Amino acid sequence: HHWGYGKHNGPEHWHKDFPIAKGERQSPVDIDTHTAKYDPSLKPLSVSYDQATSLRILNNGHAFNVEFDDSQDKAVLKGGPLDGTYRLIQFHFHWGSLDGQGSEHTVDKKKYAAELHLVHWNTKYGDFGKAVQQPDGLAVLGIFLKVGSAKPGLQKVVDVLDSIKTKGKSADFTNFDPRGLLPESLDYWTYPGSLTTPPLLECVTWIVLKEPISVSSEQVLKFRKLNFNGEGEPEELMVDNWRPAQPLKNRQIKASFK
Ligand SMILES: Oc1ccccc1S
Ligand SMILES: [Zn+2]
């Protein structure tokens, strides 16, 4: 059966195998900009990616992941709402079949064409597997993509997608610099939440950047030619791999800017 994003195994079904789906701190959420609270106690983010070592890009059947060496403090995130050092391990995207949908978080109900998740784990826990069992285990930088002008720093990724078209294909992907994917400002919203895919673990401190990056229609078109299926299986295009917004419940969205 295996979870996915179709009519018979999509988000509305996940709770049957993953009861945390109906949890207290699920993601994504809509960010109501008038109800978010400015917090002057919040620090600026510290992104230190100059020593990043990318290894591989992989189609895992529900997105593509770019993987990094996380055996040392090469690429890390500090500051913001975080205590401690968080190591970059991978990034992926979620995107839509149309330009008007694709992001997971929304801002005053507005949807963007895609959302970038840069995933980091708290080095006090020793490895990624242990971190995801902890309420402060991961920090995920969420960046919105809107369609407009091309993003130079995304094109090396776009170029290699045809070689990982189906589930289980991987390719070498060294010397990729993720700084090419950041917006110019690092102002953010932050709230405690979860993975937006199974197993939906409630271990994430979300950090959602205010400023979107722009990408060209031609760049996102190439995302939409990937396949959910494996080679030799009937073709299903990899589109709309996003989960709808979940109820905020007892949580406060905090803003770093006023
Ligand atoms: O947010 C971390 C790891 C894997 C997937 C998502 C986050 S969707
Ligand atoms: Zn994600």
Curated annotation (Swiss-Prot):
Disease (UniProt): Osteopetrosis, autosomal recessive 3: A rare genetic disease characterized by abnormally dense bone, due to defective resorption of immature bone. Osteopetrosis occurs in two forms: a severe autosomal recessive form occurring in utero, infancy, or childhood, and a benign autosomal dominant form occurring in adolescence or adulthood. Recessive osteopetrosis commonly manifests in early infancy with macrocephaly, feeding difficulties, evolving blindness and deafness, bone marrow failure, severe anemia, and hepatosplenomegaly.
Residues binding Zn(2+), per UniProt: 92, 94, 117
Effect of residue 196 to S/V: Reduced activity
Reported impact of residue 60 to D: Strongly reduced activity
Resulting phenotype, residue 60 to V: Reduced activity
Effect of residue 117 to D/N/Q: Reduced activity
Tagged with keyword Cytoplasm: yes
Uppermost EC category: lyase
Signal peptide positions on this chain: none
Chain sites annotated for binding substrate: 196-197
Record's miscellaneous remark: Target of drugs used in treatments against glaucoma disorder and breast cancer.
Positions of post-translational Phosphoserine modification: 163, 170
Protein name as catalogued: Carbonic anhydrase 2
Its EC number(s): 4.2.1.1, 4.2.1.69
GO molecular function ontology, one term from the record: cyanamide hydratase activity
Cofactor note: Zinc. Can also use cobalt(II) with lower efficiency, but not copper(II), nickel(II) and manganese(II).
Cofactor needs: Zn(2+); Co(2+)
Top-level lineage group: Eukaryota
Cellular component, GO, one term: myelin sheath
Site (Involved in the binding of some activators, including histamine and L-histidine): 90
GO terms classed as biological process: angiotensin-activated signaling pathway; carbon dioxide transport; morphogenesis of an epithelium; neuron cellular homeostasis; positive regulation of cellular pH reduction; positive regulation of dipeptide transmembrane transport; positive regulation of synaptic transmission, GABAergic; regulation of chloride transport
Consequence when changing residue 119 to K/R: Strongly reduced CO(2) hydrase and p-nitrophenyl acetate esterase activities
Alpha-carbonic anhydrase domain: residues covered: 1-257
Stated regulation of activity: Activated by X-ray, histamine, L-adrenaline, L- and D-phenylalanine, L- and D-histidine, L-His-OMe and beta-Ala-His (carnosine).
Variant or mutagenesis effect after changing residue 60 to L: Reduced activity
